[PDB]
Amino acid sequence: IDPKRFGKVAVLFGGESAEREVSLTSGRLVLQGLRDAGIDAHPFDPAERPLSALKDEGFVRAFNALHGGYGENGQIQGALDFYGIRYTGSGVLGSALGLDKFRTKLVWQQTGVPTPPFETVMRGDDYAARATDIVAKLGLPLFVKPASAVLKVKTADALPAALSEAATHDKIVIVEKSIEGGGEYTACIAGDLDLPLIKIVPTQYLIPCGLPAEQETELKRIARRAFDVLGCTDWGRADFMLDAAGNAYFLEVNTAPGMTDHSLPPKAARSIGIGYSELVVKVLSLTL
Amino acid sequence: IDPKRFGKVAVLFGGESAEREVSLTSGRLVLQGLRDAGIDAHPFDPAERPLSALKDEGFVRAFNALHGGYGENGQIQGALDFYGIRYTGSGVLGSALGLDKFRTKLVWQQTGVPTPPFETVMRGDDYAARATDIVAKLGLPLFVKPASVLKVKTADALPAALSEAHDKIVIVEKSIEGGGEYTACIAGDLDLPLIKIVPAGEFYDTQYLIPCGLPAEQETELKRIARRAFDVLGCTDWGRADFMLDAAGNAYFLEVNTAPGMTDHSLPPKAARSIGIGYSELVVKVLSLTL
């Protein structure tokens, strides 16, 4: 509680990625929220300030409010570790593995975390021949996702152009069975806060998620397992589908979620009476 | 080819790990080998120079001759990516996963790369009961190995072996008996031969033998599978994959190394020399993959 325990804090935000503008907003609010708590927090945009200034100006820890690019892929995590600066959320492995959808799914398959069945296609494959085999094996519809803009494919005839197009963006393309007839949900994770699931509606976000309490409790538990087996910690989201029968299938994790005053973790927290400042203090307190 | 194409090159070496002295040796030889090729290469010890100096003094790429610690685990790779400096070997995912035994083996199991069966101990649990059930499930001997090394030959000695420990997660791996231990060095498309690793007590200290002693057809197939074992973890371009054979010649991969030694007694220069590729050529080949 004593804000002095946090010492001098950098709020990392902005950056060089396509999500710079969202990160500017996140970081401004995180900054406000930490200062509201009396914490000695300062803005630090690594696209503008030398990263060596963190150590040189006596910064001891950072709230990472970057999104995309080096803020989320293990790169700035590795650099912060190298410089001795503590930081929020996941470390190098968890950040890098969380962004690799292919290897995230292999680890889930080996650890009992359910995930939709999928095939891979390599750049330079006979995409038409692969498409035929994959429809025979998985059925339709399918999502075609780069391994590290997702396309939904509803007919067999549309699949080869989708593979070819995805292969332009990644040497490896994931072709994943779509889970139909249920719903889409996300579990926000912030320490051991009991944040409610959020249902994602075909763009709109719904709390309560519409599920019975016992099912919600189990799904939050499995979602935390899905996150922790990839080496992620403390802060993020796990996205998943249910089918019509209520079986869960995990899609991906997010290790750098938004902190705009309407992004999902603040919404989930506000719904249980935890305000924005309290949420950011809680997340930062995990670095103590 | 044209040395000017590499621009200004840092050789990262030294560092702060327990293997600093081997890195010092490797880095001194790599530096000389790049210079002998006419490349504009300079020493850069990150334990002594600020990493900001790379970008500030106009370095465009680095040969990573660090071993262990931040040179191998993705930390310095992330920092270099952050600074826009190209570097040899694996990037952040491959480097961090190649040091994580638990997830390395899960990925190998899900992708058909053979690896010894294993159990995890959460410490955590009753080490006495886990030890009993692991011996039942796996057999003996076992290795107790960090998840993120002790060879145990009786069931009695395991609970204590577990007690000692990463921590929270312990790997208990079946030992592969009656064959040999081997390594496959990887350097771009060089067809580097396998090397047999022979413990000092079995050589009538540790000895490295080329040729590895296996028939050509088998060696060809093992080089291919070893490259796949390295590549499925996200590692690229430069490193080793280590494996055992049992008595019948079945292979089991044990681990990868993404920052291998470059002394005159290290494995990649020996594998390369045996196919007529000298040291200077090997370092230029590795660096060329950064173009």
Numbering used by the authors:
A (entry chain A): 4 to 151, 157 to 210, 226 to 311
B (entry chain B): 4 to 151, 158 to 174, 177 to 215, 225 to 311
What does the paper say about this structure?
We used an “ortholog rescue” approach to maximize structural coverage of these gene families, which are likely to be essential not only in B. thailandensis, but also in related, but more virulent, Burkholderia species, such as B. pseudomallei. Using only seven Burkholderia species to select orthologs of essential genes, we solved structures for 49/406 essential gene families, and for 56 total Burkholderia protein targets (including seven ortholog replicates). Of these 56 targets, 25 satisfied criteria for being a potential antimicrobial drug target.
One strategy that has been employed to improve success rates is to “rescue” such proteins by adding orthologs from related species to the pipeline, based on the assumptions that many of these will have slightly different physical properties that may improve their solubility or crystallization, and that close orthologs will have structures sufficiently similar to the original target to be useful as surrogates in drug design. By using an ortholog rescue strategy for insoluble or difficult to crystallize targets, we increased our structural coverage of B. thailandensis essential genes from 31/406 (7.6%) to 49/406 (12.1%).
